[PDB]
Design a protein around this ligand. Structure first.
Ligand SMILES: *[C@@H]1O[C@H](CO)[C@@H](O)[C@H](O)[C@H]1NC(C)=O
Lengths: 49, 96
């Protein structure tokens, strides 16, 4: 603990992204908004625009 | 120790589990048989499963029944490995 900030240990986590063509099984989220009806709107339902 | 099909392991890539594909139960009564169907398709690095089950009552181990039936999908598999051969398995515990 008495050591300097430069000598202090730092826990490092490194993420590597491998864009493999076939699986594409895991990735980040995709936020969804509220639902409205009886209005001329642009809908994106599970990728259907 | 029924897992006699495999003896050696390696790195795994996909571990999905779900409700069993064979939900037909014989506990009700006999005199009817199952008609499990399965279609396997492996394209563009994907895999699909289709299945339907209908009773037949009459066994007649000669030919498939004369009837039309749709086959809806069950699960989609994202594994993109090469497939060239098909092998099935059986359930046999001991002579009886
Ligand atoms: C095996 O898969 C790789 C990549 O998915 C492909 O380049 C190769 O042609 C395949 N070989 C066979 C025999 O399917």
């Amino acid at each position: 603990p008495t050591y300097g900030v430069g000598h202090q240990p730092y826990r490092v986590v490194v993420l590597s992204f491998e864009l493999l063509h076939a699986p594409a099984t895991v990735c980040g989220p995709k936020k969804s908004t509220n639902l409205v009806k009886n209005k001329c709107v642009n809908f994106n339902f599970n990728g259907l625009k | 120790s029924e897992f006699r099909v495999y003896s050696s392991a390696n790195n795994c890539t996909f571990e999905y589990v779900s409700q069993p594909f064979l939900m037909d139960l014989e506990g009700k009564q006999g005199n009817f048989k199952n008609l499990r169907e399965f279609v396997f398709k492996n394209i563009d690095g994907y895999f699909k499963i289709y299945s339907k089950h209908t009773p037949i009552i009459v066994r007649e181990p000669e030919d498939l029944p004369q009837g039309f039936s749709a086959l809806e999908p069950l699960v989609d598999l994202p594994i993109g490995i090469n497939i060239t051969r098909f092998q099935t398995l059986l359930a046999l515990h001991r002579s009886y």
